[PDB]
Structures are given as structure tokens and as C-alpha cells.
Design a binder for this molecule. Structure first.
Ligand code: HEM
Ligand code: HEM
Ligand code: HEM
Ligand code: HEM
Lengths: 145, 139, 145, 139
């Protein structure tokens, strides 16, 4: 549940987000900081070093897809459970990803947003985006519920 | 925990500089705003924006982290009294340590955009997780 | 999602559960093994030692109420979300209990059941009861979701 | 840990006796039945009931736990090769270590009802948590 001011701030900050890079670096930083997550991305090639992860075209493209999913979730903040039903099926039944990794990736995305926005990212903006990422993770983890 | 991580952590925390208390106060404010369940550990505190009590507490937390950076090789002995306090006197849930570590990382990312490379991010995450592990070792 | 055989085994084992000591034992073991949970029970008196925790009338009575809710939820396995709505609000907003402690309490209850039943608590029975406690914890954490 | 915890864990694992392999196989069977997400780490295994592969792996796990009990004061060094294996090669999610620790506790409770007093339960939980945090140290 986000107030109108929180929703306005979230949309305003998402308006200036680079959709071709931000998801890629969020996914790469997830792979680097939580290296057990590399077990789901074996077919992505070289992932041994941070430079190899952040220079990986497969990681860039998959992060672009993940960022698109996050944007779609942002456009339906009141229907997150229905927006992420197919992705929840994909991640739980076949991938077997643990729902805690969803929280980890959302927090990595928040850190990436802070790293770009800096002073413009503010503690209230962080609170709104933490609400958003918690909602997205809960919706994506529903098939475990 | 590797020596490369130790070097990266020392470099990042050194470039933090004398703003350590400001960073700690901002991280505490971020934690209070984002995770209000953590506010229950500070019932006697003024938890409004710009609060002097939060400023002093952030200074104390930042000084503790500076000591931890100075003693990364002897963290259990450096943070013994703090672990005893946080586990016996306060009985803090171990998840709030993760929450505060995340808010510290967000403050560092927002205030040192250049230094916050993926390698430095991983090193700082490992450092903060080790401080949290040490502080929760009395459980 | 429990199969009919799992439901039958679960109710058969729950038929032999003593409702006067199992809940108090589970609550006391939770307090002993996860002592940060003692933060929520400061009015319960002396909780310094395992024997003082396990000999506490307040702990025994509160464990009876928690077991009764577990039995109430067990009687409606298809409506856990509606069975635990009022309980979920009291923990999330009034008590501010992290939803991981719900899973901890469920796991301690499973350990208590194994300790009592022994050979009767077979791995299939344990799997069914893990499903039950996971559903109960998910229902109790609805306000955070 | 604590000296009383070490004594309680040593006594409980002694009462386990020579049934360590049986208890480990039962714990692994319990983990596979209760948390099927852990079965993805054994794609080359026959994971049916009474499977000799699961029996042998459970015996290996129980031998590792017995070595940890005998070396309770030097777990990080006694479990260094296992930590390397699990963190680098296997890349196991840390959550699964909690799952296996819970299943080990359930097996111990179901097989040693008299030994499983609340103090022994707490001591064994602390011991298994220490083993898990050693095996996830590289992360
Ligand atoms: C937390 C929010 C997440 C979102 C919004 C998200 C989104 C997506 C999307 C849009 C796809 C592509 C689905 C398709 O092409 O049909 C995907 C696939 C995938 N996801 Fe996620 N993801 C998230 C978290 C994670 C995490 C944390 C992991 C692993 C630790 C993970 C592992 C994977 C893998 C391995 C695939 C490849 C499957 C495929 O390409 O079909 N995801 N995800
Ligand atoms: C890296 C993590 C942390 C560090 C380095 C840290 C550091 C400190 C320090 C240095 C003090 C001062 C102790 C004193 O003056 O006697 C303190 C006190 C305290 N801490 Fe933390 N802390 C951390 C995490 C947390 C978290 C996550 C919480 C709660 C959610 C918490 C709750 C408290 C409380 C309630 C006090 C008492 C302060 C007062 O009453 O004046 N701590 N901490
Ligand atoms: C996991 C399953 C749980 C169930 C089924 C459950 C059930 C209950 C029930 C039936 C009550 C009585 C409410 C009333 O009498 O009005 C209650 C209250 C309470 N619960 Fe739980 N509980 C659970 C977990 C927890 C946990 C893990 C904690 C703390 C770590 C906790 C802390 C409390 C406290 C402090 C109260 C007192 C509220 C009052 O007296 O009004 N509960 N719960
Ligand atoms: C209680 C903590 C654990 C202990 C003491 C333990 C111990 C061991 C031991 C002794 C081995 C055999 C070493 C070797 O011969 O190479 C092993 C291998 C293995 N463990 Fe664990 N383990 C633990 C937890 C886990 C968990 C939670 C998982 C994931 C579900 C896991 C997955 C594996 C796998 C996949 C192997 C390799 C099996 C094979 O390919 O034959 N372990 N572990």
C-alpha cells in the first residue's frame, strides 16, 4: 500500500531510469555479491570474476528482461499478484529459486538506484521503493504460499 | 573474508572520511523509515527527522564500525561488549542487523557513487555481514 | 496443498496430541532456543534458565492458546488465510513480530511432535506437518505480505 | 559456543553411537521429502526410499558431524575442505543448511526421546548452527 505522494515519487524516479543498463548491473551485482545465485545461470558463460560478470552480454540481456518485469509490476502496483503469476510458476516449479533471493535482488536493485540517483534518492524515496520491491518479491513468491 | 576485501573496505571507509556520524545518522533514519518494526527498540528516542538523539546514536554506530574496520582481523574481541549488549540486554532480532546493513550500504552507495563499484559493494557487504555475525554470535 | 493421505495421517497423529502440555512445551523450547523471542514475553516472569522457562505457568497457558489456534487452523486447512486474519493483524501491527519467528515456532512444534511420537512420526508424516506449519505461518504473516 | 553446550552435544552424539550413518540417511530422506527444492543438488542420485546412494551420503555427512563434534573447538579448520566444496563447487544456497539442520534435529528427537531435553535441544541447535556457518563461511 503506497500513498499518492509515494507513488508520484516512485514514478518520477523511475522516469529517469536507464532501462538498458540498470537491470543488467542489478543482476550482475546480485551474481557478484551472492555468488550461490550463479548456480541458476550456468548457461551464461564466464562468471568467475566481477569484471566477467559485469561484462557478460547474457547477463545484460537477462537483466533487461528482469527490469522490464519490474517496470510492468510498477505499472500495476495494485495487481502485483496477478501480474507475476506466470513468472511465479516459472521460478518456483521449474527454477526452484528460494523466495529469499527475490528479496536479495530487490535490495540489490535498491542499492543500484541509490548508486545512480545519489542525493535525489532520499530516505522517503527509499522507503517507497522498499515497499515496491517487497511487494514484487511477495507476488513472485506466491506459488510457495 | 579475503585480504582484497579488507583492502577495499578500508579504502571505502577511509574515503567516507569524517562524515561517519552523518552517514550513521542517515542510515538509522533510512532504517526507521523503511522498516518501522525496528523503531520498537528505541521507545525513549526522538525518532523524527534531524533528531539529536538519532544523530548521537549514528555517531556511536559509525565509531563502532570504524573500530571494526581498524580491527577486521580481531572482530570478535573488538566487538565483544557490543555483542553482549545486543544479544543479552537488548535482545535484537538477527534480521534487523541485515536491515541496518542494507541501509548502511544504501547510504554508502548514495554518498560515494564512484567508489561503489561491484567489487567494493561485495567487499562492504561481506564486512557488514561479518560485523552482524559477530554481534549475533552470543545467540 | 495436502493430499488426502497426508491429511488423514496429520489428523490421526493430532488425535493423540495432548493439548495441555504440547503447546507450552513448544513455546518454552522456542524461548530457550531462540532467546531473542523472550523480548515479546517480558510479563511472563522469570525466563533466565531453561528450567525457569519450562516451569512457567504463564508460558504454559500461552502455549495452550497457541496450540488451540494451531488446532483451529488444522480443522480448516483450506481457509488458513481467513482463519488467522485477526491473529495476523495482532502480531504484525500490535506486537511487531518478524514472520521468521512463525516458521521457527512451527519447526520447534515439529521437533516436539517428533520427540513425543518417535517412530510414529515417519518422514511422510513430518513432510505433511511441515506443509501444515508452513501454511499456518504464511497465513499468520499475511499482514506483512 | 559454551562449555555446557559442548558437554551436552558430546553426550548426545555419544548416545547416537554407531547409528550415525542410519541417522544421517534418515535426515537426508526427511530433507528430500519435506523440502523437495534440495533435491536439485543431487541430479545424479537415486533418491528413492532405501537408496544405497542416500545411505552412503548420509554416512559421510554423519562422519563429518562426528569429526566436528570431536573437534568442536577447531571447527573452521576441521571443516575447511567441506566449506570449499559446498561454497565454490556445489554453490549450495545457505537456506538449505538450515533445512538440513532442522531435519537432523528432528531425527535426533525422534530417536533419542529421553536425551532430547530443552537444554540438549538448544545445545544441538547451537552446534548445528556453528557447523552451518562454517560451511557457508566462504560466502
Ligand atoms: C526478484 C525479482 C525477479 C524478477 C522480476 C525476475 C524476472 C524474470 C523474468 C522476466 C524472466 C524471463 C521469463 C521468461 O523469459 O519467460 C526470468 C527468468 C529467470 N529468472 Fe528471474 N526474476 C527475479 C528474480 C530472480 C532471482 C533472484 C533468480 C536467481 C537467484 C532468478 C532466476 C532466473 C532464471 C535462471 C531465469 C531464466 C529462465 C528463463 O530464461 O526462462 N530470478 N526472471
Ligand atoms: C552493524 C550493526 C550495529 C552496530 C555497529 C551497532 C552499534 C551500536 C553501538 C556502538 C551502540 C552504543 C552502545 C552504548 O552506548 O552502550 C548501540 C546501541 C544500541 N543498539 Fe546497535 N548497532 C548495530 C545494530 C543494531 C540494530 C540493527 C538495532 C535494532 C534494530 C540496534 C539496537 C540498539 C539499541 C536499542 C541500542 C541502545 C542505545 C540506547 O539505548 O542509547 N543495534 N549499537
Ligand atoms: C507461529 C504460530 C503462532 C500462533 C498460531 C500464535 C497464536 C497466538 C494466540 C492464539 C495468541 C493469543 C491472542 C489472544 O489471546 O488474544 C497469541 C498472542 C501472542 N503471540 Fe502468538 N502465535 C504464534 C507465533 C508467535 C511468535 C513466534 C511470537 C513471538 C516471537 C508470538 C508472540 C505473541 C505474543 C507476545 C502474544 C501476546 C498477545 C496478547 O497476550 O494479547 N506469537 N498468539
Ligand atoms: C549439515 C551440514 C552438512 C554436512 C556436514 C555435509 C557434509 C558433506 C559431506 C561429508 C560430503 C561428502 C564430501 C565428499 O566426499 O566430497 C558432502 C557432499 C555433498 N553435500 Fe553436503 N553436507 C551438509 C549440508 C549440505 C546441504 C544442505 C546440501 C544441499 C542440499 C548439501 C549437498 C551436498 C552435495 C550435493 C554433495 C556432493 C554429493 C555427491 O555428489 O556425491 N550438503 N556433504
Amino acid at each position: 500500500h503506497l500513498t499518492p505522494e509515494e507513488k508520484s515519487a516512485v514514478t518520477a524516479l523511475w522516469g529517469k531510469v536507464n532501462v538498458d543498463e540498470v537491470g543488467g548491473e542489478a543482476l550482475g551485482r546480485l551474481l557478484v555479491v551472492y555468488p550461490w545465485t550463479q548456480r541458476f545461470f550456468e548457461s551464461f558463460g564466464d562468471l568467475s570474476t566481477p569484471d566477467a560478470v559485469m561484462g557478460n552480454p547474457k547477463v545484460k540481456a537477462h537483466g533487461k528482461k528482469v527490469l522490464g518485469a519490474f517496470s510492468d509490476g510498477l505499472a500495476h502496483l495494485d495487481n502485483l499478484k496477478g501480474t507475476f503469476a506466470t513468472l511465479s510458476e516459472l521460478h518456483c516449479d521449474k527454477l526452484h529459486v528460494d523466495p529469499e533471493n527475490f528479496r536479495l535482488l530487490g535490495n540489490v536493485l535498491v542499492c543500484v538506484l541509490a548508486h545512480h540517483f545519489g542525493k535525489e534518492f532520499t530516505p522517503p524515496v527509499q522507503a517507497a521503493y522498499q515497499k515496491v520491491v517487497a511487494g514484487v518479491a511477495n507476488a513472485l513468491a506466491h506459488k510457495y504460499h | 573474508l579475503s585480504p582484497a576485501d579488507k583492502t577495499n573496505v578500508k579504502a571505502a571507509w577511509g574515503k567516507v572520511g569524517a562524515h561517519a556520524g552523518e552517514y550513521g545518522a542517515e542510515a538509522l533514519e533510512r532504517m526507521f523509515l523503511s522498516f518501522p518494526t525496528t523503531k520498537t527498540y528505541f521507545p525513549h528516542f526522538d525518532l523524527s527527522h534531524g533528531s539529536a538523539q538519532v544523530k548521537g546514536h549514528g555517531k556511536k554506530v559509525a565509531d563502532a564500525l570504524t573500530n571494526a574496520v581498524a580491527h577486521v582481523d580481531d572482530m570478535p574481541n573488538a566487538l565483544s561488549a557490543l555483542s553482549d549488549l545486543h544479544a543479552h540486554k537488548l535482545r535484537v532480532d538477527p534480521v534487523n542487523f541485515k536491515l541496518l546493513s542494507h541501509c548502511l550500504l544504501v547510504t554508502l552507495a548514495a554518498h560515494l557513487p564512484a567508489e561503489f563499484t561491484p567489487a567494493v559493494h561485495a567487499s562492504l557487504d561481506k564486512f557488514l555481514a561479518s560485523v552482524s555475525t559477530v554481534l549475533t554470535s552470543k545467540y
